[PDB]
């Protein structure tokens, strides 16, 4: 959470980065999300939210893999797929 707060605040530094956030956000969120609001969103998050949210998107989900280069040892898609769940859990 702290990393993300740092990132956010740090990223919004100077005319350009800000201007770009305005214009782009208007496109995407319809409005401009005031720093404070992001800070509130981040604060809400804690371990449980992470586990629940991570599981929702990553747990036992099908990956899209892209490879390039000396990839002979890149694991087979089945194998990568199997790595998206744990037999302990």
């Amino acid at each position: 959470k702290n990393l993300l707060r740092n990132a956010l605040v740090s990223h919004l530094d100077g005319t350009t980065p800000v201007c770009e956030d305005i214009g782009r956000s208007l496109l995407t969120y319809g409005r401009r999300i005031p720093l404070a609001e992001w800070e509130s969103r981040i604060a809400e998050v804690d371990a449980r939210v992470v586990r629940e949210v991570c599981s929702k998107y990553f747990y036992d989900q099908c990956p899209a893999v892209a490879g390039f280069g000396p990839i002979e040892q890149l694991p087979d898609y089945n194998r990568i797929r199997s790595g998206m769940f744990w037999l302990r859990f």
Binding site: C62, P63, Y77
Partner: protein, 79 residues
């Protein structure tokens, strides 16, 4: 022993693949299946089948003559 990564050298080949949970396990099982086994059978009858019918012919004739050798034996013994 030999591991992936130390097998051999490969140049410029792309390989697209798909998740098993995204495709069918039996695409066109019968539609494309039968035609193909016909095709593979056809492709090989002539080298596999011949020696077997040869055995087949020799097996039926072989037992035949075995019975007709003794049972048929008498036959004639006339005096």
């Amino acid at each position: 022993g030999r591991q992936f990564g130390h097998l051999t050298r490969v140049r410029h080949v792309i390989t697209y693949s798909l998740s098993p949970f995204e495709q069918r396990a039996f695409p066109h099982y019968f539609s494309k299946g039968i035609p193909n086994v016909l095709r593979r059978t056809r492709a090989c009858i002539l080298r596999v089948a011949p020696p077997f019918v040869a055995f087949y012919l020799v097996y039926t004739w072989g037992t035949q003559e075995f019975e007709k050798s003794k049972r048929k034996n008498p036959a004639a013994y006339e005096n």
